[PDB]
Amino acid sequence: MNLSRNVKDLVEKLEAASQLPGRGKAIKRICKLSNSDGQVVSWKFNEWDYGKNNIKLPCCARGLFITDDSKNPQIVARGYDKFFNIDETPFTRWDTLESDTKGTYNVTLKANGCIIFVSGMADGTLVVCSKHSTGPDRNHADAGEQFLLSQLKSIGIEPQQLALELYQNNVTAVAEYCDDTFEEHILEYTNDDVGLYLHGINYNETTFRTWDMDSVSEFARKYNFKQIKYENFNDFTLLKKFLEECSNSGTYHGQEVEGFVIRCKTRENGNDFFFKYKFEEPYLMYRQWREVTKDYISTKSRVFKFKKHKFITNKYLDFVIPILDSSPALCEEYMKGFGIIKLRNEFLKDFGMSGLEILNHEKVLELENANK
Ligand SMILES: Nc1ncnc2c1ncn2[C@@H]1O[C@H](COP(=O)(O)O)[C@@H](O)[C@H]1O
Ligand SMILES: [Cl-]
């Protein structure tokens, strides 16, 4: 008779929102369980419908999976809420966050691998889903399932125990997995270590409540998950100091960083809230280099439409075009998404400056080379 996991109100609200023609139309997708052969419903909204005070959503979870019961639907799997970059929304501006949020501020690196949700049902089933798919898509759900079973065998923990512990806490584990079949990202990642990383744990409720990272680590050691680096800053001023110093330095712990995911609790009602701080440079310059490289490999055309980093991009083309012309093997891997970072650093070595050092004296050097 336990109605503590009944979510039929939210199910009714989602079904009603499904019929809405154009604004806030609930998107429904029925998947089949890979273990129990039963069915689970995945709900999802349009991205442009998120994060707007004029568009109230029944739930704000990126990834939501509910059971297929007409008298007691239960949230099988829940992901994080949709959270946005700084200044992207009026409630992620650099001034509103200090006023309306408190500590403790937790900073993790931006994920690079595929995201998977691991939960458990009453029947001991270990339900592994991915971006709105459990049938199964990217099929990273099944890849991560194989990784998880392999790592559970390595510690002798049966998947039944993990499913039962998830069910008893009514939690979904959000995990990032990075296979070697994955492509390279523009900025290098020092936590490649192919396997399953545990990004967090959420309670399967309509509202967003996530475990603190220490509990996540304790759960991960209990189930052979690869731990994730993070740092804690108690106040907003310390966090702004760390973020601005890291941006002025471009190195977190001797590594190139694309972005940070920062978790905190809102000052009013003490609810969890995430926001992203993305370092625009040197990500933009490197991605422009990669795009012009792919354009040359596919067309042998070195004309580009960019307005920023034009001189350094032309120098990069001067250095790299002979390499691409005379190394057909490098072109194939580059098009497949490999060797981007190595070729980038080869150019950075030829030019004699670091990427940040290039960015610092760039208008100086561009105007100087134009003047000559
Ligand atoms: N560590 C992370 N950094 C950035 N986005 C994340 C992370 N973990 C999960 N996401 C979610 O992934 C989605 C965007 O991924 P993508 O657009 O494929 O880069 C959004 O729903 C994010 O909230
Ligand atoms: Cl509800």
Side-chain angles (χ1 to χ4, degrees), residues 1-137 139 141-372:
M1 302 191 55
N2 170 74
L3 296 185
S4 63
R5 299 196 177 187
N6 197 10
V7 74
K8 67 183 182 70
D9 317 71
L10 172 58
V11 186
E12 170 181 335
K13 295 162 188 175
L14 294 179
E15 283 285 354
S18 175
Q19 316 297 339
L20 302 185
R23 208 56 178 172
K25 177 179 61 184
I27 303 176
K28 176 177 175 181
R29 156 172 157 81
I30 299 186
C31 317
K32 280 195 181 64
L33 292 177
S34 54
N35 316 82
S36 165
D37 274 353
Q39 297 182 340
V40 285
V41 190
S42 179
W43 293 86
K44 41 198 169 179
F45 283 98
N46 306 271
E47 283 213 52
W48 44 95
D49 280 322
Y50 284 107
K52 279 153 188 172
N53 287 22
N54 40 279
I55 308 168
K56 313 276 189 178
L57 302 90
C59 189
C60 304
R62 288 303 275 164
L64 173 55
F65 305 84
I66 317 183
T67 45
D68 198 19
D69 194 298
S70 65
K71 286 291 185 177
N72 202 286
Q74 295 193 342
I75 300 169
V76 196
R78 192 201 195 274
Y80 301 141
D81 270 359
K82 185 77 198 81
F83 51 105
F84 308 94
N85 301 260
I86 297 175
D87 276 310
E88 182 175 350
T89 59
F91 60 97
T92 52
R93 298 191 287 109
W94 255 351
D95 54 79
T96 309
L97 289 172
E98 180 178 7
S99 301
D100 300 8
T101 67
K102 65 177 181 179
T104 314
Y105 295 91
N106 190 289
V107 175
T108 68
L109 259 162
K110 176 201 192 68
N112 299 90
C114 205
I115 206 80
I116 63 165
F117 307 135
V118 175
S119 42
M121 302 191 71
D123 54 5
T125 298
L126 194 60
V127 186
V128 178
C129 321
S130 184
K131 160 202 174 185
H132 316 140
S133 82
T134 185
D137 201 63
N139 205 73
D142 284 62
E145 202 167 0
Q146 307 319 307
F147 275 91
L148 173 57
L149 295 173
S150 157
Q151 73 180 47
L152 287 184
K153 281 187 168 186
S154 191
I155 55 162
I157 272 66
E158 196 171 335
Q160 177 189 20
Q161 176 186 0
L162 170 59
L164 284 196
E165 184 154 0
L166 298 177
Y167 189 80
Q168 290 169 15
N169 285 263
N170 188 62
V171 288
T172 299
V174 192
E176 157 200 344
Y177 111 101
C178 319
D179 199 9
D180 268 329
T181 68
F182 278 49
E183 292 185 353
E184 295 175 343
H185 291 216
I186 269 67
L187 285 184
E188 205 165 27
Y189 37 99
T190 57
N191 55 329
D192 195 4
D193 269 56
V194 173
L196 255 183
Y197 289 87
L198 184 53
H199 209 20
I201 297 174
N202 304 325
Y203 282 114
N204 297 33
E205 298 189 25
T206 311
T207 54
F208 183 24
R209 287 201 302 117
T210 177
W211 291 19
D212 54 328
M213 289 296 300
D214 295 21
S215 307
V216 183
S217 294
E218 293 185 12
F219 203 88
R221 308 188 204 104
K222 197 179 184 180
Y223 291 97
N224 199 26
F225 286 102
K226 301 195 174 191
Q227 312 193 33
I228 282 191
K229 195 177 191 174
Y230 61 95
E231 285 192 39
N232 263 328
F233 298 86
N234 207 268
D235 56 77
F236 191 92
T237 45
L238 278 183
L239 177 55
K240 89 165 187 179
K241 288 257 288 191
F242 164 79
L243 291 176
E244 292 189 355
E245 290 155 14
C246 205
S247 64
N248 295 7
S249 307
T251 59
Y252 168 68
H253 270 219
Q255 77 160 73
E256 307 161 8
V257 278
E258 175 183 353
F260 284 145
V261 172
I262 309 176
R263 321 182 175 188
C264 62
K265 295 193 176 183
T266 58
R267 208 152 51 83
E268 170 172 312
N269 272 14
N271 290 328
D272 294 319
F273 178 55
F274 297 0
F275 54 93
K276 312 169 180 171
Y277 187 23
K278 197 186 184 311
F279 307 98
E280 303 174 6
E281 295 287 356
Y283 185 87
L284 171 62
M285 182 179 58
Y286 294 164
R287 211 200 74 255
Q288 287 179 178
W289 295 354
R290 185 200 61 168
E291 288 188 11
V292 73
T293 307
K294 300 183 72 175
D295 287 352
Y296 182 84
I297 294 181
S298 57
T299 65
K300 297 209 302 176
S301 174
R302 65 165 296 169
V303 54
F304 49 88
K305 320 169 186 178
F306 315 115
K307 265 69 185 181
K308 196 175 184 182
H309 316 305
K310 184 173 183 300
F311 164 66
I312 199 63
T313 302
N314 274 318
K315 291 300 296 176
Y316 170 89
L317 283 159
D318 302 330
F319 174 77
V320 166
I321 281 174
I323 303 184
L324 298 181
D325 286 327
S326 56
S327 68
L330 171 59
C331 307
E332 307 177 11
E333 303 303 306
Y334 203 107
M335 290 310 296
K336 295 188 178 185
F338 290 83
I340 310 174
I341 305 175
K342 186 160 186 173
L343 193 62
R344 164 184 99 236
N345 286 282
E346 286 189 36
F347 169 64
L348 294 180
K349 199 175 185 178
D350 176 60
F351 203 86
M353 309 190 67
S354 167
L356 296 98
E357 297 170 355
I358 286 179
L359 286 171
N360 273 96
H361 343 89
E362 189 167 16
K363 285 296 183 179
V364 176
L365 280 188
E366 182 162 7
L367 224 182
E368 170 185 340
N369 198 94
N371 200 20
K372 299 172 185 174

